[PDB]
Amino acid sequence: MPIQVLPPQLANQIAAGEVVERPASVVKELVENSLDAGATRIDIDIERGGAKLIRIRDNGCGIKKDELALALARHATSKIASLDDLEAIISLGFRGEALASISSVSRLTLTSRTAEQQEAWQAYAEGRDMNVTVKPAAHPVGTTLEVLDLFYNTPARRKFLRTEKTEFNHIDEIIRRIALARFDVTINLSHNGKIVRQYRAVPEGGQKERRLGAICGTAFLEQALAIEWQHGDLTLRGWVADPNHTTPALAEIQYCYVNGRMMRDRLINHAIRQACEDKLGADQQPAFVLYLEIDPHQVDVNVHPAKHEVRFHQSRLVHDFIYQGVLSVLQ
Amino acid sequence: MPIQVLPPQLANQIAAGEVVERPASVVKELVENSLDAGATRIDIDIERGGAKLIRIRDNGCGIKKDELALALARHATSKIASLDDLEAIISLGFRGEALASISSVSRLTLTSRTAEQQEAWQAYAEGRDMNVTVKPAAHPVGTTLEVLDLFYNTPARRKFLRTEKTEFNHIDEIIRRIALARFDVTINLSHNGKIVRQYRAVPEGGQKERRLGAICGTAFLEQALAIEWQHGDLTLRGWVADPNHTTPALAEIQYCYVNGRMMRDRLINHAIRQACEDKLGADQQPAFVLYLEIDPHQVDVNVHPAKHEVRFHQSRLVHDFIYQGVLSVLQ
DNA sequence: GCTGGAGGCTAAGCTAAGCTGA
DNA sequence: TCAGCTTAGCTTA
Ligand SMILES: Nc1ncnc2c1ncn2[C@@H]1O[C@H](COP(=O)(O)OP(=O)(O)NP(=O)(O)O)[C@@H](O)[C@H]1O
Ligand SMILES: Nc1ncnc2c1ncn2[C@@H]1O[C@H](COP(=O)(O)OP(=O)(O)NP(=O)(O)O)[C@@H](O)[C@H]1O
Ligand SMILES: [Mg+2]
Ligand SMILES: [Mg+2]
């Protein structure tokens, strides 16, 4: 058997194996792409638990017609030009294996119109080589993605899809986590056409209690302890629940963000777990939302396909900083 | 800010961010390539903790000149042709992004000679466009990879290399895990030219115990309890230590394999952790080397870039099966 | 003697609570 | 004001 180059559709389907875990991961990737384009209104429209239709609409800068084809392509992005840019990144996007993977394992139609361009355009990728065709359409300034029949072309991945309810629950979990990360963009979720969740954006210099309550819950809000802890460029803000009377209903909310990204990292969770176990004695594991800010040069984020976990250049210092911050919180 | 295709060197450097974590990951990837290729003698030579030179030599099938050129390329492999092959994986390779990534973040000089072809060939990929140069060389039947000056051209990642000692410790850990996974191949590790570890291959139907002692110490062997728990298609074989007198020195040995690949999976580790914490006190978490064998269709392995986390189609059944197996072991 | 790095399910069905229609 | 339907929480696989 010879060493032969995989056809681009097959290569993208393999990339979809790591970056597209469930319909929830498709919603996360498309929402992040909209947020990086400076969008303020995000309208997500899940149908049949994401298996049938996932539609995301935004009021972002859009994708001009000629570059629409290269947007759907693989290893093609407008967020890095060289390794130096990758060292100091601010966007939620580095590589071009985001739209390529989803378009490979589904029927992805990309409708967009930039503010400068008068007329909107559609683009969808099909075939063994994933060629893209651009048809004219009507849309306001912004972009709309429709992911239809997810894993239609990969029978094995469809076998992995769970029931309609659980898949929407995972999509709702990702929407809630994105909404907390950015308290400045309105996110409107809708399942089977019936509105499920609406978060109205609090403007810069506003009250953060209302939206956080709508996402976390009233119990978390009345039991929230807002914090601010700085040892230099390391700054840890956010709300931590009180462990004295935390209920199992509140236990599900354990989110941590590093420079505005969703972190499911071992180091940070372990630091909080040690802090909780030291000033309590047992694993009550109280609810918390922590926003950590560091120079992007002290952190490496190109570590995981879905960019959940992160590698810190100052691992022991960051662990000590988070541990001291949570220890101060429990006072 | 236009959408531009990333140059191949940059794209491969980004892939290296996820697949090439440390010199240990480079040793793991190159050793896996040799085993699947069919090798009985693997000779690894780490110099200056992997930072200066990593050389892996095998007695495998080798790579002919034209296929040698495509070996260094990205998305080029001889282990999958279509999705059906990806469903029915019996090899340790799916994508072509491992050698492309290592050749991107280092000076990779692949040298090989197949059994049939007359003479050996040395091939290396260089430049921002990653052109491949194939010069003549001398080598017996098999292949040799030399990774020199790891992360020389990526200063951002070199700062993450810890020391000479720790990097070799991680390489030694991966070598011991590979050796246990296949008791069929001789693996000879050498640091700065001084032999550190030698494991001689036990012939088919041979006694495993002596090699297991060389990898996990005599204490594991006097405290070993072999198992064969089989329910339906699921078979959990291997050796588990006794928690009655387990030392912290033995606690480092917690390896688990799914269809003969090294798993750092959340579901499996969690199941063993629950089983140990139910029939023990003070979180004893005893040492174990357990081989799970499952139908290749009921587990998905294309889940993580470094392939140490699997997605099971029957998550609850597999968790219960492993939990029951370890619970039976602890009596 | 000092120094790195942190193990840690997941999903479906049933029952209870709240809101809307008769 | 009471009954029925939908959504959330809990339990077992
Ligand atoms: N909603 C949007 N509005 C405007 N531009 C967009 C939008 N979505 C995607 N784009 C652009 O289109 C390109 C498509 O590439 P993509 O694969 O999404 O890159 P990425 O976001 O950097 N990838 P990743 O690292 O996986 O997150 C991006 O570089 C964006 O700049
Ligand atoms: N030691 C070796 N001996 C023989 N053939 C080899 C060897 N190493 C690599 N090859 C061949 O070169 C190709 C390149 O493999 P590589 O780029 O590492 O990806 P892969 O191993 O096929 N998949 P992945 O698990 O992602 O790394 C393989 O398909 C093999 O056919
Ligand atoms: Mg993207
Ligand atoms: Mg490989």
Numbering used by the authors:
A (entry chain B), B (entry chain A): 1 to 331
From the paper:
DNA mismatch repair is essential for safeguarding the integrity of the genome. The repair process is executed by a series of proteins that together search, find and remove the mis-incorporated nucleotide from the newly synthesized strand. During this process, MutL plays an essential role by activating the UvrD helicase to remove a large section of the daughter strand containing the incorrectly incorporated nucleotide.
Although we used full length MutL during sample preparation, in our structure we only see the N-terminal ATPase dimer and 13 bp of dsDNA plus 8 nucleotides of the single stranded overhang, resulting in a protein-DNA complex with a combined molecular weight of ∼85 kDa. Two N-terminal ATPase domains of MutL (MutLLN40) form the canonical dimer confirmation similar to the crystal structure of AMPPNP-bound MutLLN40 (37) with both monomers containing an AMPPNP molecule bound in the active site. The symmetry of the MutLLN40 dimer is broken by the DNA, with the double stranded section positioned on one end of the dimer, and the single stranded section on the opposite end. The specific recognition of the 3′ end of the dsDNA is performed by monomer B that thus positions the MutL dimer at the same DNA end that is the substrate for DNA polymerases. To do so, it interacts with the last base of the primer strand through a helix (residues 315–330) that positions R316 in the minor groove of the dsDNA.
